[PDB]
Amino acid sequence: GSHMNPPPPETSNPNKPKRQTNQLQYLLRVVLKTLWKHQFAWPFQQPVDAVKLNLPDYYKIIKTPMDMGTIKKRLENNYYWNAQECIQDFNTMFTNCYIYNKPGDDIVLMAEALEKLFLQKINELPTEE
Ligand SMILES: COCc1cc(Br)ccn1
C-alpha cells in the first residue's frame, strides 16, 4: 500500500522456530474464530491504515502495531513457538487501541467487547499436552 504506512508485522520467517501446540490450535480454532466473527471485529481485521484514516501521528505513537489479520496469518502459517507469543499479540492489539484513543471512543468500546470475550476464552486455554 502507501509508503507512508509501515510494513506490517512479520508473518513469515524461515529462521524463526515454530511449533504446533494444542494451545496454539485452540487459539486458532476457538479464540481467533470467536473474535473474528464478532460484530465489532472489523476495525481490527487488518493493520491500521493511518493514511486512509488521516491519522498521521498513529505510527509515531504506536511503535508496536498489531492486528487480528496479522495474528490470523501467524496462526494459519504456524509462525509461533508457543501460546504466550500469540496471547501477547492480542494484548498488544488491545493496548494499542487504549493508548491511542480516548476512553469511551467507539473504537475503545469495540476493543473492550473483544477483550472481554478474549479473556473468557483464554481462561479456558487447555493444559499444554
Ligand atoms: C482514530 O482511532 C485510531 C485507531 C483506529 C483503528 Br482502525 C484502530 C485503533 N486506533
Swiss-Prot record:
<comment type="subunit">
    <text>Interacts with p53/TP53; the interaction is direct. Interacts (via CTD region) with CDK9 and CCNT1, acting as an associated component of P-TEFb complex. Interacts with RELA (when acetylated at 'Lys-310'). Interacts (via NET domain) with NSD3, CHD4, BICRA and ATAD5. The interaction with BICRA bridges BRD4 to the GBAF complex. Interacts (via NET domain) with JMJD6 (via JmjC and N-terminal domains); the interaction is stronger in presence of ssRNA and recruits JMJD6 on distal enhancers. Interacts with NSD3. Interacts with NIPBL.</text>
</comment>
<comment type="similarity">
    <text>Belongs to the BET family.</text>
</comment>
<feature type="site" description="Acetylated histone binding">
    <location>
        <position position="101"/>
    </location>
</feature>
<comment type="function">
    <text>Chromatin reader protein that recognizes and binds acetylated histones and plays a key role in transmission of epigenetic memory across cell divisions and transcription regulation. Remains associated with acetylated chromatin throughout the entire cell cycle and provides epigenetic memory for postmitotic G1 gene transcription by preserving acetylated chromatin status and maintaining high-order chromatin structure. During interphase, plays a key role in regulating the transcription of signal-inducible genes by associating with the P-TEFb complex and recruiting it to promoters.</text>
</comment>
<protein>
    <recommendedName>
        <fullName>Bromodomain-containing protein 4</fullName>
    </recommendedName>
</protein>
<feature type="cross-link" description="Glycyl lysine isopeptide (Lys-Gly) (interchain with G-Cter in SUMO2)">
    <location>
        <position position="60"/>
    </location>
</feature>
<comment type="subunit">
    <text>(Microbial infection) Interacts with bovine papillomavirus type 1 regulatory protein E2. This interactions may serve for the tethering of viral genomes to host mitotic chromosomes allowing successful partitioning of the viral genome during cell division.</text>
</comment>
<feature type="domain" description="Bromo 1">
    <location>
        <begin position="19"/>
        <end position="125"/>
    </location>
</feature>
